[PDB]
Paper text:
To further investigate how the structure of the [name] channel allows for ligand-initiated gating, we have now determined the 3D structure of [name] bound to adenophostin A (AdA), a highly potent agonist of InsP3Rs,8,9 to 4.1 Å resolution using single-particle cryo-EM analysis. To understand how ligand-binding triggers a drastic change in the permeability of [name] channel to specific ions, we determined the structure of [name] in the presence of activating concentrations of AdA (100 nM) and Ca2+ (300 nM), which works as a co-agonist to promote channel opening, as demonstrated in numerous electrophysiological studies. The map resulting from the class of AdA-bound [name] particles exhibited robust density bridging the β-TF2 and ARM1 domains. AdA is uniquely oriented such that its 3′′- and 4′′-phosphates interact with the ARM1 domain and the adenosine moiety bridges the binding pocket interacting with the β-TF2 domain. Specifically, the vicinal 3′′- and 4′′-phosphate groups of AdA extensively interact with residues of the ARM1 domain, while the adenine ring of AdA interfaces with residues of the β-TF2 domain on the opposite side of the ligand-binding pocket. These complementary interactions provide the impetus for pulling the two domains towards each other, reducing the interstitial space of the binding pocket by 5 Å in the AdA-[name] structure. Ligand binding in the tetrameric channel results in a 5 Å closure of the cleft between the ARM1 and β-TF2 domains, while β-TF1 acts as a pivot for the concerted movement of ARM1 and β-TF2.
[name],4,5-trisphosphate receptors (InsP3Rs) constitute a functionally important class of intracellular Ca2+ channels that are capable of converting a wide variety of cellular signals (e.g., hormones, neurotransmitters, growth factors, light, odorants, signaling proteins) to intracellular calcium signals, which trigger markedly different cellular actions ranging from gene transcription to secretion, from proliferation to cell death. The cellular signals are transmitted to the receptor by the secondary messenger molecule [name],4,5-trisphosphate (InsP3), the primary agonist of InsP3Rs, generated within an essential intracellular signaling pathway initiated by phospholipase C. There is a general consensus that activation of channel gating is associated with conformational rearrangements at the inner pore-lining helix bundle that are triggered by InsP3 binding within the first 600 residues of the [name] protein. The present study describes 3D structures of neuronal type 1 [name] channel with and without the agonist bound. In this study, we have also extended our structural analysis of [name] in an Apo-state to 3.9 Å resolution. Together, these structures reveal how [name] channel performs its mechanical work through ligand-driven allostery that removes the molecular barrier within the ion permeation pathway and allows for Ca2+ translocation across the membrane.
Numbering used by the authors:
A (entry chain B): 4 to 321, 353 to 529
B (entry chain C): 1299 to 1317, 1323 to 1346
C (entry chain C): 1972 to 2211
D (entry chain B): 2644 to 2739
E (entry chain A): 2692 to 2739
F (entry chain A): 146 to 193
G (entry chain A): 4 to 49
Write the structure that this text describes.
């Protein structure tokens, strides 16, 4: 508490201020420029989703070897560097990229101050920031295109500068500075150009041109929660029981988000761990993410990823377990009990057993297995209520969830939904030109991203050891990969 | 011509200042600054 | 010119410029010189072959800048080597690259220039290393040349052979014999060997075999003079 | 020693044996208690293997660090609370 | 009759131990009490 | 069912497995006061 | 208060839970096997 903001790698977010007051919003995963949405909620009240402004204070790595690596396409046009020379040369470029890291790790610790030149990178999409100096925007050619790179390039070169720059140069950056950046090489500062966009009533183009566009340093979480074990922030979990070996599954069966848990197959083996364990748990304070980090008296809401639905409970009367669309009630704000052992060291727990107390009804939460529906055996409707007894059978814990898979799946699912929309356009009639140039050939690139298990070795019929993901393949079947099948049916059928 | 550092003014004039197989190679480079987006046109 | 001016007597003149006051007047140039040299060779890791060709006569100024590197090189061990040590961990690479490799274009006066550059770079490095003792500092420059004894041996054999093959009858106009350059390298390696043990193991191996150019060259010189200057010093010097 | 050792395989009774059982082959002139062994200077097992000016300094630092890890933090918290309370009195003083 | 490098080290340890036997315990107790009080405010915040 | 005896001296059926009810509390950690401890005789087999 | 239960030789007791919820009860001193008494009081009230 001597002063804040001393470490590159912070867990923060951003907000537009001024003409159109939006947020840093990647429209999907496959697009290339962010948007400015008045669709988004207040500056004091972020929307139901706010996971898109996930930037991090990146060091200024180099790109010259990576540039001379990519000089390599010009060498594809022409050879002779050629062969081993070419390889070693780009291999050296790769070593230099390794060296960029073997700088950033050392770099952590630096007090982030005024006038510096820093880089950025997303987390949710985990894509880069580069503004072109010769490739324009969509609305005006004078505005420069702000790109989302897989690797990152020299348009990641910024000027961390507030609105007026009344805060004089050299000092640390106050959390709340209206940070007007400036590209080093590209020139033109960033603009929140208020212009309507495709499929966007609703959203405004993020671009680079001489203007007076202000921002804000918007903290989400301190740098010390970069410990990946430390279950902080919006990190995501799985609500998977252990004595039953079943995860807490939600489904809109009767057009009602019944939250239950599926009958567990196998088991002598571990979890099949389906996608109905999408849970993120966050603490509650009206300014978001208050200080103290003790996690003892901390109180929590439960959030599902794919649905726009949080989690509450009320009474049954013939106590309930369904999911709720909103985030302002008290009856959704549940509670925990860390591992049930003698611990005053629980300042941040990790990936272990949990429980629940209630606040209003103020009882424990049982998990006594009572089958309900006669719709189908190995049922899909159960009961989870709030009763002041507690047994060993409440063995609920936390999965440290693998990040990459989640991201992959989400982009695929969103693409599929648009894919469905694309299919609808074709169905109504024909489609336009550049849709073929954009997303139509991007079909198997999403398939060959995690490879889908579409090519492997050959042995006896049970797939066992190692070649591509079964999870990915089933997931592929999973985000209406069925829906994609219908879309594909429609394309040939239309022809 | 192609980007919005100017408007869509004549490609033919640009080609005239550089429109043999060499001309075709030059055209490919020119098209690259000016490639796609109906640079030749929508036909 | 700047290098020439800086070189004027070290200790006070050398030191004074080298550190200054006012953040070295918005200048602590030795690091800048290293960066400039890197840009010129722009090895940025392995030097792009030819960069030297691109330098054309221009590398000779950087050679004189490398000479100005030795211009900010001679004697003043503490200031010089404070910068030297910093550079060794810090940039060392231009010198390392020069030691590691030759030039793609067979240069006209370039062979001599390249040799001069190696000798110079070698001299600067050697001076700094000797003064320091600075073991891991030399271990870091030795971490620059991890190729070690094998690389050195190959270079020595090649240079000596070339020199013998075309011995030059141009007396005392520059001892740029291939063997002369190699001899300078050998001296530096021995000086380096006082830092590092593994390198010393490689050197012992170089000493015993089916005799070779390497033993002959040491015989042409294995001095290890060890004089001590002014006062309060415990110094060890070699020179061929 | 040489007579008893000479005679067998040399592996048997090794440690000093098969140590020196190769060492005669390369004849390297350096087996013998030249000066450094001598016995003596045990010094009560070097004060139970305890080190120099430095060991005592290290002990001071360790003690200082562990002890220091708590009190000032506490003091600051209480100071802030007391200060918060006076401000309250100040607010009452400037209250209407 | 005063001893080696060690005697001085021993003196440091003795001083440190006696001094150390009290303060952190006190600090922890007060910390817990303050924490208990904020929780009370938190309870009021989530009270109805 | 096996006889659980009260010995004057003690013998090899004093050999137990300190294990909770489900053994959901994973092996290696300390025993929580309140664990539903389902023991197991080592040599005799049959749990209590 | 860092964590409890660190020392063999503890001063504790036992309670049966489940079907019959009794205690570890030596019927007298001269017998050979313990009993499970519902005669015994509550788990919360010994
Ligand atoms: N811990 C568990 N205990 C018991 N069954 C389990 C289990 N976790 C998952 N299972 C479920 O029980 C089924 C298997 O007994 C099923 O396995 C399915 O899991 C699929 C994973 O996507 C595989 O299909 P592939 O993608 O073709 O590999 C697999 O078949 P496989 O042997 O070929 O891998 C199979 O279909 C799986 O959950 P489901 O009921 O199947 O949804």
């Amino acid at each position: 508490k001597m002063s804040s903001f001393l470490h590159i790698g912070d867990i923060c977010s951003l907000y537009a201020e001024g003409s159109t007051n939006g947020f840093i919003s990647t429209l999907g995963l496959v697009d290339d420029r962010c948007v400015v949405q008045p669709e988004a909620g207040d500056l004091n009240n972020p929307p139901k989703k706010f996971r898109d402004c996930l930037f991090k204070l990146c060091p200024m790595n180099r790109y010259s070897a990576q540039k001379q690596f990519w000089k390599a396409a010009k060498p594809g046009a022409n050879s002779t560097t050629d062969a081993v020379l070419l390889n070693k040369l780009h291999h050296a470029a790769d070593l230099e990229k390794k060296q960029n890291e073997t700088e950033n790790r050392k770099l952590l610790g630096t007090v982030i101050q005024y006038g510096n030149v820093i880089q950025l990178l997303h987390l949710k999409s985990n894509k880069y920031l580069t503004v072109n100096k010769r490739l324009p925007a969509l609305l005006e050619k004078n505005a420069m295109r702000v790109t989302l790179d897989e690797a990152g390039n020299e348009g990641s070169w910024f000027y961390i500068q507030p609105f007026y720059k009344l805060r004089s140069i050299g000092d640390s950056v106050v959390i709340g500075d209206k940070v007007v950046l400036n590209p080093v090489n590209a020139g033109q500062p960033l603009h929140a150009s208020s212009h309507q966009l495709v499929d966007n009533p609703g959203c405004n183009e993020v671009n680079s041109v001489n203007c007076n566009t202000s921002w804000k340093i918007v903290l989400f979480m301190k740098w010390s929660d970069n410990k990946d074990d430390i279950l902080k922030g919006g990190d995501v979990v799985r609500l998977f029981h252990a004595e039953q070996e079943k995860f807490l599954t939600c489904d809109e069966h009767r057009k009602k988000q019944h939250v239950f848990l599926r009958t567990t197959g196998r088991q002598s083996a571990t979890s099949a761990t389906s996608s109905k364990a999408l849970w993120e748990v966050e603490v509650v304070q009206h300014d978001p993410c208050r200080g103290g980090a003790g996690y003892w008296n901390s109180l929590f809401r439960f959030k599902h990823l794919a649905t726009g639905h949080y989690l509450a409970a009320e009474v049954d009367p013939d106590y309930s377990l369904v999911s709720v669309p909103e985030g302002n009630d008290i009856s959704s704000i549940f509670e925990l009990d860390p591992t049930t052992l003698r611990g005053g060291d629980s300042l941040v727990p990790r990936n272990s057993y949990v429980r629940l107390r209630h606040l209003c009804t103020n009882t424990w939460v049982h998990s006594t297995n009572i089958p309900i529906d006669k719709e189908e055996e190995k049922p899909v409707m159960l009961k989870i209520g709030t009763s002041p007894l507690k047994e060993d059978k409440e063995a609920f814990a936390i999965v440290p969830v693998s990040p990459a898979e989640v991201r992959d799946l989400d982009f695929a699912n969103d693409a599929s939904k648009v894919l469905g929309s694309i299919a609808g356009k074709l169905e109504k009639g024909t489609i336009t030109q550049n849709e073929r140039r954009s997303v139509t050939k991007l079909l198997e690139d999403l398939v060959y991203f995690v490879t889908g298990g579409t090519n492997s070795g050959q042995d006896v019929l049970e797939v066992v050891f190692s070649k591509p993901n079964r999870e990915r393949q089933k997931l592929m079947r999973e985000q209406n990969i069925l829906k994609q099948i219908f879309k594909l049916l429609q394309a040939p059928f239309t022809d | 011509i192609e980007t919005h550092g100017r408007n869509v003014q004549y490609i033919k004039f640009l080609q005239t200042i550089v429109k043999i197989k060499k001309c075709q190679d030059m055209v490919m480079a020119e098209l690259v600054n000016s490639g796609e987006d109906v640079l030749v046109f929508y036909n | 010119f700047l290098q020439l001016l800086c070189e004027n007597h070290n200790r006070d003149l050398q030191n004074f410029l080298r550190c200054q006051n006012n953040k070295t007047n918005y200048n602590l140039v030795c690091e800048t010189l290293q960066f400039l040299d890197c840009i010129c060779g722009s090895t940025t890791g392995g030097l792009g072959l030819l960069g030297l060709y691109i330098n054309e006569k221009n590398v000779a100024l950087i050679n004189q800048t490398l000479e100005s590197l030795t211009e900010y090189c001679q004697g003043p061990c503490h200031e010089n080597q404070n910068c030297i040590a910093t550079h060794e961990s810090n940039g060392i690479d231009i010198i390392t690259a020069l030691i590691l490799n030759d030039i793609n274009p067979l240069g006209k006066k370039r062979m001599d220039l390249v040799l001069e550059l190696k000798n110079n770079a070698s001299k600067l490095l050697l001076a700094i290393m000797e003064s320091r003792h600075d073991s891991e500092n030399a271990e870091r420059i030795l971490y620059n040349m991890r190729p070690k004894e094998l690389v050195e041996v190959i270079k020595k054999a090649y240079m000596q052979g070339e020199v013998e093959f075309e011995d030059g009858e141009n007396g005392e106009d520059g001892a740029a014999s291939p063997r002369n350059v190699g001899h300078n390298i050998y001296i530096l390696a021995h000086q380096l060997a006082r830092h590092n043990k593994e390198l010393q193991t490689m050197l012992k191996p170089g000493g015993q075999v089916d005799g070779d150019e390497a033993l002959e060259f040491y015989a042409k010189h294995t001095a290890q003079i060890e004089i001590v200057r002014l006062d309060r010093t415990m110094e060890q010097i070699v020179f061929p | 020693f040489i007579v008893l050792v000479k005679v067998k395989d040399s592996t048997e009774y090794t440690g000093p044996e098969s140590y020196v059982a190769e060492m005669i082959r390369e004849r390297n002139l350096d087996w013998f208690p030249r000066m450094r062994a001598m016995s003596l200077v045990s010094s009560d097992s070097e004060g139970e293997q305890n080190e120099l000016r430095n060991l005592q300094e290290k002990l001071e630092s360790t003690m200082k660090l562990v002890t220091n890890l708590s009190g000032q933090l506490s003091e600051l918290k209480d100071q802030m609370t007391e200060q918060r309370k006076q401000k309250q009195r100040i607010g009452l003083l400037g209250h209407p």
